[PDB]
Design a protein around this ligand. Structure first.
Ligand SMILES: CCCCCCCCCCCCCCCCCC(=O)OC[C@H](COP(=O)([O-])OCC(O)COP(=O)([O-])OC[C@@H](COC(=O)CCCCCCCCCCCCCCCCC)OC(=O)CCCCCCCCCCCCCCCCC)OC(=O)CCCCCCCCCCCCCCCCC
Ligand SMILES: CCCCCCCCCCCCCCCCCC(=O)OC[C@H](COP(=O)([O-])OCC(O)COP(=O)([O-])OC[C@@H](COC(=O)CCCCCCCCCCCCCCCCC)OC(=O)CCCCCCCCCCCCCCCCC)OC(=O)CCCCCCCCCCCCCCCCC
Ligand SMILES: CCCCCCCCCCCCCCCCCC(=O)OC[C@H](COP(=O)([O-])OCC[N+](C)(C)C)OC(=O)CCCCCCCCCCCCCCCCC
Ligand SMILES: CCCCCCCC/C=C/CCCCCCCC(=O)OC[C@H](COP(=O)(O)OCCN)OC(=O)CCCCCCC/C=C/CCCCCCCC
Ligand code: HEM
Ligand code: HEM
Ligand SMILES: O=C1C(=C2CCC(c3ccc(Cl)cc3)CC2)C(O)=C(O)c2ccccc21
Lengths: 54, 104, 45, 32, 56, 423, 55
């Protein structure tokens, strides 16, 4: 087997976002979840910094 | 009476507005696969099953390519085939019978 | 639904009524004991 | 074959509540 | 044969889980009060003369 | 035209009589050219001590091997020249010898039947031949797995009590039992007031009674010195026996609780319950096994090794369902199944004769089908709920398992399955 | 919730503690959300089953 599939943590990552089967025909409306996650991450980082002065 | 021609007129209008014919698809192709529909699809003979699968893949490819078939190849309202209805009616009868047994 | 109208369902509900009102008693008394609800607890000797 | 089967004795562990046998079986069960 | 105490206790109260639970809430209601009163009595008694409740 | 229940009135009566020595004669006449006649005896393995456990099976092996009046194979040749059949059996609690024959042969039949139970020739040579045969029959694994698990169940449930012990007994005993033991066994247990002479078919009752006085009336009746052995009273233990062997294809499992015995009424309702219960696995059954004062009430199944847990879950869930939530519609079906079984069993003379004998030993009397029908008609969902709760709900079971039984749940997990937290 | 007779200093620290802790609960629940999603897979614009054309 490839290391991609050798191990539980790695195999969960693989089933999540490498070898996951996705529809071929989904449109731009399906991009907004990943942007939501990005926004959450941005907020947490900028907040941890602000926190140290408020 | 005339009422038949009138109702069929509005029905044809609604069919052209829906536009799955532009993708080369039949009406029975467009059902959502609940439990009964999946069991009806299980019962199909091989030729119908294969035709359905290819038609659906072709529609998906077109949708990927933001395109449609040539007008010459659209599904016409007057010569369509409701190939799945009969099997579905039987599946639903069977389920109804079992329910009715379950309340006695 | 319309499915669950019939003899078996009536019999089945009757089978579970007592357990239902016993759990009701449990929940009521517990709530009262937990919130020192005087409206009920003032009647306990 | 199997017919030679016999559970070994558990006398040391069993409760006195069944050894003092002057009471029907199922009533004992209830007490325990 | 021998109607014994724990057997009556099993058959009346503990056999059914709802009633077991009800028994438990009812027991805690009364245990709480009895236990508090006993403890407060002991405490008060250990150090009479030094608490401001009575000096008041 | 009649109703079922009305047809039950046309079934003929069972006549019963007594001899002076206390042997009872029972018959049902059915106007046929063929008949079954036997002797049933109120003796079995639960009257044997560890010193002679296995004596009755030994005696059964050389019952038909010769009498004084008919040395050796003469008896066999006379049975075979009539065209008749001869059979026997032995149980935890009963023993039986019967013959199938033409109705013309009743005088000879009874004669032979009396010659067998009073005048067997226990010859040393034949004893040693049977000893070798039984040892050979025990050496190799000549037992079916079903028998193995049911023997294990009796051993764990009735441990420390005579019912735990098997009919065949241990091998250590058959290599050590003597003629003295056999003759003492017979002298102590084979007494007239413990015997029944039963007949079904084209047999007239008074003729049978005359023949019984002629050929069976000299059997003694005076129990002497109360020579009968003292033995331990009944007790049931919640326990498990596990025999692991991961090379066998499939796992066998048996689980019971304690039943009420022959005498109680409740049995009827329980049977109905059984019929309601009886996919995952290959094979499954429910059972009731009755004794004088106790019994086993439970189920037996075979599974692939990866599907034992689910199956136990399903079974215990059905039990809890019946205890808490039964309904009328299913109960009706179970009653009909039970009716069909009762009437189907009693077809032909042999089963009927057998029923007469067993009934007069267990009940003291033949119970007619009409009475059974009246008892069945009274059951209803409320009765089922009540009685199932009375014997199954929150009880400790006896468990036995044989095979690849790693996945058989732990005993605490099984015990916790006997009750519901939501009830 | 006020910790007093009115809005005041004791309420602001409560707002700040809660605002600090909630985003991480949001993160965990997002992971559960996606776990649930990946058991079936994504729907698509046509509303018909896409198992013949997965990439
Ligand atoms: C000082 C500040 C400066 C700011 C500068 C900002 C610069 C921004 C640059 C952005 C560049 C983006 C490039 C993206 C490339 C992506 C390529 C791709 O794959 O795209 C796929 C994606 C489509 O995805 P899809 O897979 O087809 O799926 C979508 C549908 O499912 C498909 O379904 P369908 O096929 O059925 O749909 C067909 C049709 C459906 O059509 C309809 O529904 C009908 C529409 C009819 C409209 C008619 C005219 C209007 C109405 C008039 C009605 C009459 C009124 C009468 C009144 C009477 C009164 C009496 O829809 C379309 O075709 C839509 C195409 C156009 C999309 C426009 C996107 C606009 C984005 C705006 C961003 C603004 C924020 C910027 C930042 C600001 C910061 C301050 O997009 C495209 O294909 C188009 C790409 C090109 C877009 C260019 C957008 C440029 C915007 C410039 C804005 C500048 C001004 C900002 C003002 C700010 C004010 C605060
Ligand atoms: C923190 C420190 C940590 C580190 C410590 C370190 C040391 C740790 C060492 C120890 C580690 C232990 C590990 C866990 C072992 C677990 C074993 C196990 O699962 O065995 C499986 C065990 C083995 O059986 P099996 O072989 O699987 O057979 C399955 C059969 O179906 C068997 O059938 P069955 O009929 O016999 O049993 C089924 C039934 C048996 O249970 C019952 O029927 C009832 C049991 C007693 C009554 C409990 C009622 C609780 C109701 C919810 C709370 C409200 C209470 C009243 C106040 C109302 C306030 C408005 O149970 C269920 O169906 C499960 C749910 C039961 C509760 C129903 C409510 C569900 C929703 C819960 C959330 C509610 C939130 C909102 C509340 C309202 C708004 C505040 O079977 C079970 O299913 C056991 C059930 C265990 C349930 C536990 C429930 C706990 C949660 C209670 C609520 C909490 C929220 C309270 C919020 C505030 C309001 C009061
Ligand atoms: C929202 C706030 C207010 C909530 C108030 C809650 C009110 C209800 C309280 C009920 C308490 C008693 C429930 C007993 C249920 C037993 C079920 C069971 O399975 O038992 C047998 C089981 C297993 O027993 P077993 O296996 O030996 O045998 C059981 C078999 N039968 C039933 C046949 C006898 O026993 C347990 O292990 C149960 C442990 C329960 C522990 C509960 C701890 C107390 C938690 C609640 C009180 C604290 C509330 C604080 C509120 C503060 C508000 C400011
Ligand atoms: C001192 C100044 C800093 C110097 C920095 C130097 C390093 C610069 C960056 C180098 C990046 C790494 C490039 C090479 C990676 C090689 C990975 C490798 O060989 O593993 C591949 C192979 C792939 O797996 P399979 O699919 O099973 O292969 C089967 C093939 N049929 O193995 C793996 O699974 C990957 C293993 C990854 C190992 C990565 C090691 C990284 C080491 C980094 C050291 C950095 C040092 C920094 C020092 C700073 C000053 C103190
Ligand atoms: C922090 C908030 C949220 C995050 C980070 C998040 C994240 C995601 C992501 C990454 C996906 C992958 C597919 C896609 O991008 O479309 C997704 C799908 C989905 N989300 Fe969420 N989401 C959030 C909130 C919500 C809300 C508020 C709803 C509904 C009210 C919702 C419902 C769904 C559904 C139904 C899907 C799958 C639908 C489909 O695949 O067709 N989510 N989400
Ligand atoms: C979903 C995640 C978050 C959202 C939606 C969010 C939202 C907000 C908003 C709207 C404000 C006020 C903006 C303003 O007054 O101009 C704010 C302020 C603040 N947030 Fe965040 N926040 C998030 C995460 C975090 C995290 C993880 C922290 C960690 C400490 C944090 C720390 C702060 C602080 C210290 C302030 C006050 C500073 C200021 O007002 O500029 N935030 N937040
Ligand atoms: O973007 C995703 C997606 C995921 C990609 C990775 C993202 C992500 C966000 C943050 C980090 Cl640190 C890593 C990955 C989370 C969303 C995911 O699980 C899907 O199932 C999916 C399906 C259709 C279209 C898009 C997606």
């Amino acid at each position: 087997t490839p290391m991609r599939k050798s191990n539980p943590i790695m195999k969960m990552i693989n089933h999540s976002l490498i070898d996951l089967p996705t529809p071929s025909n989904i449109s731009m409306w399906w991009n907004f979840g990943s942007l939501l996650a990005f926004c959450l991450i941005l907020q947490i980082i900028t907040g941890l910094f602000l926190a140290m002065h408020y | 009476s005339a009422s038949g021609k009138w109702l069929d007129g509005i029905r044809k209008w609604y069919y052209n507005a829906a536009g799955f014919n532009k993708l080369g698809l039949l009406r029975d192709d467009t059902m959502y696969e609940d439990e009964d529909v999946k069991e009806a699809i299980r019962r199909l003979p091989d030729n119908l099953y294969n035709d359905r699968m290819f038609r659906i893949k072709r529609a998906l490819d077109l949708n990927l390519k933001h395109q449609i078939l040539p007008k010459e190849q659209w599904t016409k309202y007057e010569e369509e085939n409701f190939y799945l209805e009969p099997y579905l009616k039987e599946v639903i009868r069977e389920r109804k019978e079992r329910e009715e047994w379950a309340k006695k | 639904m319309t499915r669950f109208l019939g003899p078996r369902y009536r019999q089945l509900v009757k089978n579970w009524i007592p357990t239902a009102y016993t759990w009701g008693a449990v929940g009521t008394l517990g709530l009262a004991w937990a919130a020192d609800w005087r409206l009920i607890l003032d009647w306990v000797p | 074959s199997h017919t030679d089967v016999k559970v070994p004795d558990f006398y040391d562990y069993r409760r006195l509540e069944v050894l003092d046998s002057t009471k029907s079986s199922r009533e004992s069960s209830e007490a325990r | 044969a021998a109607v014994a105490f724990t057997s009556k206790l099993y058959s009346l109260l503990f056999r059914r889980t709802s009633t077991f639970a009800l028994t438990i809430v009812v027991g805690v209601l009364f245990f709480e009060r009895a236990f508090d009163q006993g403890a407060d009595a002991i405490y008060d008694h250990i150090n009479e003369g030094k608490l401001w409740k009575h000096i008041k | 035209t009649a109703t079922f229940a009305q047809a039950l009135q046309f079934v003929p009566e069972t006549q019963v009589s007594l001899l002076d020595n206390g042997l009872r004669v029972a018959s049902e006449q059915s106007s046929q050219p063929t008949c079954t006649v036997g002797v049933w005896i109120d003796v079995g393995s639960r009257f044997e001590t560890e010193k002679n456990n296995g004596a009755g099976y030994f005696l059964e092996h050389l019952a038909f091997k010769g009498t004084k009046n008919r040395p050796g194979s003469a008896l066999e040749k006379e049975v075979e020249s009539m065209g008749a059949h001869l059979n026997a059996y032995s149980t935890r609690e009963h023993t039986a010898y019967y013959i199938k024959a033409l109705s013309k042969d009743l005088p000879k039949v009874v004669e032979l039947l009396g010659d067998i139970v009073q005048n067997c020739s226990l010859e040393d040579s034949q004893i040693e031949k049977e000893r070798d045969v039984i040892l050979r029959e025990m050496q190799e694994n000549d037992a079916s797995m079903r028998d193995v698990v049911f023997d294990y169940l009796h051993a764990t449930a009735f441990q420390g009590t005579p019912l735990a012990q098997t009919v065949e007994g241990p091998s250590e005993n058959v290599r050590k039992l003597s003629r003295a033991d056999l003759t003492e066994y017979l002298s102590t247990h084979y007494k007239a007031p413990r015997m029944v002479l039963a007949a079904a078919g084209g047999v007239e009752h008074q003729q049978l009674l005359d023949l019984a006085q002629k050929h069976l009336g000299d059997i003694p009746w005076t129990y002497a010195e109360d020579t009968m052995p003292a033995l331990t009273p009944c007790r049931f233990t919640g326990s498990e026996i596990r025999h692991r062997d991961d090379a066998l294809p499939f796992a066998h499992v048996a689980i019971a609780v304690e039943g009420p015995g022959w005498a109680s009424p409740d049995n009827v309702a329980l049977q109905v319950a059984n019929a309601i219960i009886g996919k995952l696995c290959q094979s499954f059954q429910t059972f009731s096994i009755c004794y004088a004062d106790t019994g086993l009430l439970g189920a037996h199944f075979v599974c692939d090794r990866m599907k034992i847990d689910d199956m136990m879950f399903v079974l215990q869930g059905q039990w809890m369902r019946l205890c808490t939530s039964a309904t009328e519609s299913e109960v009706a079906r179970g009653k009909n199944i039970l009716r069909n079984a009762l009437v189907s069993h009693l077809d032909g003379t042999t089963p009927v004769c057998e029923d007469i004998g067993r009934s007069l030993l267990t009940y003291g009397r033949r119970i007619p089908l009409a009475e059974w029908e009246s008892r069945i008609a009274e059951v209803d969902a409320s009765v089922v709920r009540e009685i199932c709760s009375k014997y199954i709900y929150d009880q400790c079971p006896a468990v036995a398992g044989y095979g690849p039984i790693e996945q058989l749940p732990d005993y605490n997990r099984i015990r916790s399955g006997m009750f519901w937290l939501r009830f | 919730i006020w910790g007093g007779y009115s809005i005041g200093n004791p309420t602001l620290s409560r707002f700040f503690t809660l605002h600090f802790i909630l985003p991480f609960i949001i993160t965990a629940l997002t992971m559960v959300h996606l776990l649930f999603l990946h058991e079936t897979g994504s729907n698509n614009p046509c509303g018909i089953s896409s198992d013949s054309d997965k990439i």
